[PDB]
Amino acid sequence: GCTVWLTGLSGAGKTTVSMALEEYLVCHGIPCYTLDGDNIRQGLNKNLGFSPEDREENVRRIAEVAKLFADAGLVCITSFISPYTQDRNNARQIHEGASLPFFEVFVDAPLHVCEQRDVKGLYEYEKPEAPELVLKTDSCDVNDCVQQVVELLQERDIV
Amino acid sequence: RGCTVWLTGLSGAGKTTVSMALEEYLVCHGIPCYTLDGDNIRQGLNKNLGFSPEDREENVRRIAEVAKLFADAGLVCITSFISPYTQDRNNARQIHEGASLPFFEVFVDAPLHVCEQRDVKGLYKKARAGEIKGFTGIDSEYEKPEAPELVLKTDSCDVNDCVQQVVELLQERDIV
Ligand SMILES: Nc1ncnc2c1ncn2[C@@H]1O[C@H](COP(=O)(O)OS(=O)(=O)O)[C@H]2OP(=O)(O)O[C@H]21
Ligand SMILES: Nc1ncnc2c1ncn2[C@H]1C[C@H](O)[C@@H](COP(=O)(O)OP(=O)(O)O)O1
Numbered sequence: 001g002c003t004v005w006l007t008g009l010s011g012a013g014k015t016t017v018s019m020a021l022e023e024y025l026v027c028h029g030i031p032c033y034t035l036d037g038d039n040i041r042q043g044l045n046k047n048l049g050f051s052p053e054d055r056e057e058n059v060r061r062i063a064e065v066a067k068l069f070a071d072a073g074l075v076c077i078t079s080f081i082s083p084y085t086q087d088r089n090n091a092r093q094i095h096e097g098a099s100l101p102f103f104e105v106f107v108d109a110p111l112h113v114c115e116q117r118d119v120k121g122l123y124e125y126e127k128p129e130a131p132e133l134v135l136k137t138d139s140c141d142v143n144d145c146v147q148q149v150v151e152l153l154q155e156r157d158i159v
Numbered sequence: 160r161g162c163t164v165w166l167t168g169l170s171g172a173g174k175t176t177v178s179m180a181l182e183e184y185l186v187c188h189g190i191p192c193y194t195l196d197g198d199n200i201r202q203g204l205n206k207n208l209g210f211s212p213e214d215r216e217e218n219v220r221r222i223a224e225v226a227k228l229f230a231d232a233g234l235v236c237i238t239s240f241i242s243p244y245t246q247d248r249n250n251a252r253q254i255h256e257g258a259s260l261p262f263f264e265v266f267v268d269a270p271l272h273v274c275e276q277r278d279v280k281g282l283y284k285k286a287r288a289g290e291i292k293g294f295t296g297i298d299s300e301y302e303k304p305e306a307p308e309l310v311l312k313t314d315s316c317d318v319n320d321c322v323q324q325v326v327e328l329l330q331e332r333d334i335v
């Protein structure tokens with residue numbers, strides 16, 4: 001189907017949006033799968049460390065896996081901070097060269113909100129240049145954010 | 160009902176041919192599936208790997224992890240790679256066992272002489288001439304599976320018979 005490439009600060013709402021989006025798609029009979037730290041970091045990317053080079057390879061491998069899911073006809077949602085513009089652009093081009101729909105989705109809450117949420121007590125990021133969608137997770141709720149994504153997918157005939 | 164059907168065998172043994180026919184059968188019977196092969200893996204995810212023993216180890220490790228994701232997503236994932244090393248195929252199986260996902264090792268078994276006689280891509284001739292170095296079966300090893308779930312004797316069974324053998328295994332193991 002396509003790749004829905006989430007990006008945004010820690011605590012902005014990527015895990016939450018991806019879970020609710022997958023729920024909506026599954027209940028509407030649309031095949032979908034999420035790539036996230038829980039299924040990538042200790043599997044495909046277990047042999048990558050902290051160096052810039054390895055982080056670049058981390059994103060490249062995630063993008064190539066999302067591309068296979070998209071080619072297979074799934075909505076593939078990636079849920080990573082994805083901080084660097086160059087790496088997001090590389091992920092985009094991996095898809096665009098194969099004519100696979102790619103949606104860069106900026107999960108956008110202010111740092112202050114993310115810090116106040118501190119969902120995991122964890123408490124630089126390059127904001128998306130021209131993403132296909134911005135989800136303002138401080139001003140609307142999870143269901144409205146999901147609906148914005150679904151609308152985007154309908155317009156491009158994925159849903 | 161996701162799972163991985165892991166093909167292994169010499170160049171020209173019939174992996175591409177079996178995977179295509181099996182995918183077509185499954186699609187036509189309403190069973191989601193997807194094939195991982197050289198065409199969608201070795202110039203994408205694995206574009207930064209060659210054919211040295213260590214790069215084959217990594218090729219197969221990465222493919223195993225991706226196949227686990229597809230099986231986890233509920234697809235029948237068919238992998239079509241020589242996968243010549245026992246240790247690496249066993250690791251691929253362990254990755255699936257670790258995630259409670261069924262894994263079926265299918266040995267696509269044709270004698271080397273048959274594969275050389277088929278010489279589908281002219282590679283065996285080049286290998287013998289030393290024009291390609293490290294070609295599996297000529298100048299690098301193929302370790303035959305000793306406990307595969309299924310052996311497809313592609314020199315004595317036709318493609319449709321081989322596909323039906325795989326479908327039967329999937330039925331026995333409650334996948335389809
Ligand atoms: N030296 C070497 N040895 C074996 N096959 C090679 C080699 N050079 C290239 N090819 C071509 O690549 C394919 C094997 O790649 P795999 O990813 O299946 O190999 S492994 O699982 O990593 O061992 C073969 O399929 P083909 O189209 O018949 O040509 C062959
Ligand atoms: N519209 C919205 N979308 C997503 N999450 C929201 C939201 N409004 C409030 N939240 C909350 C739910 C979670 O407690 C928190 C986001 O946590 P998360 O999804 O785990 O973040 P991330 O995966 O981006 O690190 O913010």
Ligand SMILES: Nc1ncnc2c1ncn2[C@H]1C[C@H](O)[C@@H](COP(=O)(O)OP(=O)(O)O)O1
Nearest residue numbers: 170171172173174175176177313316317318
């Ligand atoms: N039972 C069988 N299964 C698969 N291929 C068979 C077969 N009987 C004959 N063939 C032929 C079809 C092809 O020309 C050749 C196998 O080529 P292939 O599928 O490209 O091999 P591989 O992908 O293992 O390198 O053998």
